Symmetry: D2
Subunit: 271 residues, 4 copies
Amino acid sequence: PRFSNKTVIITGSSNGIGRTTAILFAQEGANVTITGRSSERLEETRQIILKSGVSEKQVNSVVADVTTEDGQDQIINSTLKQFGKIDVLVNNAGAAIPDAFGTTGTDQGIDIYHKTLKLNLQAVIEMTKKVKPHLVASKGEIVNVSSIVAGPQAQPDFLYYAIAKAALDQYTRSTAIDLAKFGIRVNSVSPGMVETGFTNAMGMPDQASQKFYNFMASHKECIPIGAAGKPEHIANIILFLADRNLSFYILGQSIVADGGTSLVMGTQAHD
Amino acid sequence: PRFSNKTVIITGSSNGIGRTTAILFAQEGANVTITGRSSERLEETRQIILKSGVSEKQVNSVVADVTTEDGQDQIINSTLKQFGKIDVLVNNAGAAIPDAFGTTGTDQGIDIYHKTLKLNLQAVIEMTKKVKPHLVASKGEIVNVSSIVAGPQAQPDFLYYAIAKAALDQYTRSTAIDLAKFGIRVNSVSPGMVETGFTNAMGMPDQASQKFYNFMASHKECIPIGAAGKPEHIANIILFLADRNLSFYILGQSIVADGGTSLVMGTQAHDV
Amino acid sequence: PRFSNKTVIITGSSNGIGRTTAILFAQEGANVTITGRSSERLEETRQIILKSGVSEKQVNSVVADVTTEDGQDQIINSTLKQFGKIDVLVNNAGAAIPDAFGTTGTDQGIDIYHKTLKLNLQAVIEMTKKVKPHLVASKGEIVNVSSIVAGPQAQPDFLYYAIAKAALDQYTRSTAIDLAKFGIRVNSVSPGMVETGFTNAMGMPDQASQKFYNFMASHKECIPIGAAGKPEHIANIILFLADRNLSFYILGQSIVADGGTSLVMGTQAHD
Amino acid sequence: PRFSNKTVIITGSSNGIGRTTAILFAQEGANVTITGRSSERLEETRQIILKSGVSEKQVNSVVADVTTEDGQDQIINSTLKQFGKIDVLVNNAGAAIPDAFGTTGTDQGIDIYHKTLKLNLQAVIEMTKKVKPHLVASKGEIVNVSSIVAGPQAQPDFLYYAIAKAALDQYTRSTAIDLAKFGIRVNSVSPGMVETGFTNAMGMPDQASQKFYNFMASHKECIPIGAAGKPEHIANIILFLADRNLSFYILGQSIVADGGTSLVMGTQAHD
Ligand SMILES: NC(=O)C1=CN([C@@H]2O[C@H](COP(=O)(O)OP(=O)(O)OC[C@H]3O[C@@H](n4cnc5c(N)ncnc54)[C@H](OP(=O)(O)O)[C@@H]3O)[C@@H](O)[C@H]2O)C=CC1
Ligand SMILES: NC(=O)C1=CN([C@@H]2O[C@H](COP(=O)(O)OP(=O)(O)OC[C@H]3O[C@@H](n4cnc5c(N)ncnc54)[C@H](OP(=O)(O)O)[C@@H]3O)[C@@H](O)[C@H]2O)C=CC1
Ligand SMILES: NC(=O)C1=CN([C@@H]2O[C@H](COP(=O)(O)OP(=O)(O)OC[C@H]3O[C@@H](n4cnc5c(N)ncnc54)[C@H](OP(=O)(O)O)[C@@H]3O)[C@@H](O)[C@H]2O)C=CC1
Ligand SMILES: NC(=O)C1=CN([C@@H]2O[C@H](COP(=O)(O)OP(=O)(O)OC[C@H]3O[C@@H](n4cnc5c(N)ncnc54)[C@H](OP(=O)(O)O)[C@@H]3O)[C@@H](O)[C@H]2O)C=CC1
């Protein structure tokens, strides 16, 4: 009942963090617009929600590319058409786009740059501007999903993904102050490693990804808390930030949720 | 129900943030140890909890000075003797101790340096060390209360209070990493302006304080969100951080809750 | 001459910080490539250098748009053609591109987003990629010019300029670590208000600009040090970071030089 | 002669960074006050100064505990007595005080806390307040020496040394803004690993320290620059910060000089 009568758009909800976030919002009694590119996985999210006893009248699934004008327009229009308003936008869609040759570092082509920023930054900007007037009317909120790769530590392998998130953080802070005069609250969450479809999207096989998780989780210099992040761990923070009654006074912040990963220095990997 | 069968110590719970935090914890089913020096205000906190349907056996009221070895031991020891364990420690007690001659800035006397750090930093460190063995056994948690005055912006008026909170943020981060090996979770919250007994404690008349709150709340360059912070605003965050089930993956962080105050540059108080 | 036998590329040297930086480098025995779009102002810079005791053979002038592939290529290649190498690159060109209709905040159009990042971010990335093999050979350095607008405080007016600089800082940190293995040192400077052609490029009249400078310099909550920044103030820091013998151990850092501006909170403008 | 006719007090100049800093200031024609507890090593610095060609009339040696009202009074008294004024104060003295049983982590005793802050924080505060009236007259400067251990990364072993430095950074920022009204410039430098007497002071055998330096320098995740810091590396920065003509616009900042150490994440130590 936390979000009863609230319409929430969750980008990237056809998998990972976005999927679980939409599921929680739904269970919380909210109208949810779930979206992604893979029709099969998007429906899977829809099914998880229906099996919850939640009506399909409270769910709007949209197959679209969030980096295209038409895709963005479809997400916004279908939500208003089915719900008549927008209370919260969660810019969750994102990915570390790899090169065709697994190239990392300064050598990554400018094409990777363009593709990564278009998704991890530009889309966030366009969705924000398009939902803006609707949030002004509903005195709504925005919750962006960033990453500790934004900084303050260097990220020398997937540099464009890193700088796009760094730009995201200042975009979150800046629109938060700008939109605050209209009663809107903009915040963010910067996850550390979380088990989702992220690594698979990068080209990592399921078995290699599992090996990645176990190593990270079992070494304290990697993840101090000793456990791999799970989708719910981030979804919980997103809902908290969207619950004005609870997180009200937090504004323009991106909460780091990384089990302590960003607090450990490279030298500390050695005794 | 969120904190049923959980024992929480809330330092500085005889007023402001600590009072409301203690109240919310009790309403959430927790055994709570409330403490402070003013016996009159501490009892007020207790009454509010009792007149909520909370049994007196779920409350441990302790009058003590958290800056002394004896006061610290009493807080922890009475909690163990009353509830049998400690699940959460919220280091909330703190204050911007004023200069006896009203001096601010670099000129503030060294005596104020000692009193300020002993309260806003040393007490937190000693309570952490003293509750540690019990939190190891319960795989509990710690939530400290810092302030945006810790940085990154400069604080030229009450410098000792500021550096004390700056030191505290690194203590939070460092004990979070050191204690994580025991299944413990240390986090913090850094509030902006919140209406409590803080300004009064500083010697400000309630009339001046109200004018301060109203002015800060009405000027977007001061508090962007447009409203003064309330004790509950910070209490909700502390409970959230104490709720391992919900906030689990957040570790060694001090969430800024200031309505945007710290995001505003001085130059931005003026229009182009 | 502490920069003798050193060849330096100074982007955006037809005006402001870049012009002064080029002057000082040349003044200290360096081969310098100056570049910009306004040939008249670019020639202005060359004459100042020449007016000294510097021979025209130590100065290479390139009229080019640093945002285009061709412009970027002309700058690098003419530098290699005339001097035979590249020891340090200073990514100074940058500008807060205004909306033709004066819009600010979240409302600024996507066209401004594209133009702002293309110059303040993309150009830096491409110049870096393009000079890399030569910096690897000379074990040279890179000095980027950022801005305090990058963060940690919000910038609700010229958001895109702000986020491009925030991304720039993480690009500086990340390339510093990636390129450190090659003996290269990447650093940066984040200026506060500086009297240059910056406000003019934005469209501000000279009278308004001087009025802006005076107000900032005379109000401690704006500029604590009590004086407007000057081109030379930023140039001195660039040279210091480019001077490996002196600043060697500084790596992946962007020194803030703002007379204390970023250290003052909005509330402190009252007290 | 960059600092000719300028009087500089360099605390902790009987070894490491302070020694080298005092030496450079002296070579630059500055009146210097070198202080420490070990008269032997203190005189060693003095000797290095005189052998540089500097007259001992511009050298004031002082043996004193910088943590006592007396020691600091003596440092300041002899400085004014022999020089009549004070232009710059460098708060360099500091150290990581070990537990009687090598105890580390949260368990370090309160005794360690007291000793650590008294030297690393309190002394800086006291020297700052005591030189203040003299810097106001001379529109002088202050340069403190902090450490990357102050944050943003956690320091779980010597917690007290870390929080004292973190407090130092906010003290630097705050006194800089406060003292700026008098034309005084306060800044700082935050070193990464530098080969000095630091480790020995901790109780580490010289052979072990060498093993430590070699290991740190040879591991990219430890020191990306590939070389251990040298006292000269930090001294260079201190003098830069003291040279108002050059570093003028930098105010209330602590320049990180760690060869990139603080930029590497714990996970990045693994492939
Ligand atoms: N996993 C981790 O460790 C971390 C993740 N993050 C952030 O989490 C988000 C990614 O989610 P998880 O984290 O859940 O990742 P996956 O689980 O990788 O989820 C990717 C999600 O975004 C969508 N998406 C990607 N590209 C597009 C596109 N062009 N158009 C529409 N939708 C798109 C996917 O749609 P579908 O596949 O159909 O396309 C899917 O729902 C990003 O913002 C990422 O940076 C931050 C830090 C760490
Ligand atoms: N109010 C604001 O705008 C902000 C407050 N904060 C933080 O909030 C905390 C203060 O609470 P509010 O903020 O609620 O302040 P008051 O409402 O000022 O609460 C002070 C609390 O701490 C206790 N306390 C102070 N000194 C001691 C001492 N020596 N021994 C034991 N208890 C002591 C008080 O006990 P009783 O009076 O008996 O002594 C009381 O419960 C501090 O940690 C402060 O830095 C951070 C940022 C902003
Ligand atoms: N002035 C201030 O207060 C601050 C400035 N900065 C940074 O300083 C830099 C700007 O210099 P000042 O600061 O000296 O500014 P101006 O003095 O504004 O200098 C702009 C410089 O960059 C060049 N430039 C702009 N766009 C292009 C382009 N498409 N192709 C080639 N050159 C281009 C100009 O060339 P010409 O005009 O021919 O085109 C000129 O040399 C930026 O990186 C800016 O963000 C950061 C903070 C504050
Ligand atoms: N070495 C490293 O890797 C790093 C060092 N630092 C900082 O450098 C400083 C220490 O110098 P180095 O770094 O050169 O260390 P040593 O080379 O360890 O120098 C210690 C210096 O400070 C003095 N000192 C220490 N305690 C006292 C005291 N109670 N009274 C008077 N003087 C005292 C010493 O005097 P003498 O022994 O007579 O007493 C000596 O000149 C500290 O500020 C430290 O935090 C920061 C980061 C890294």
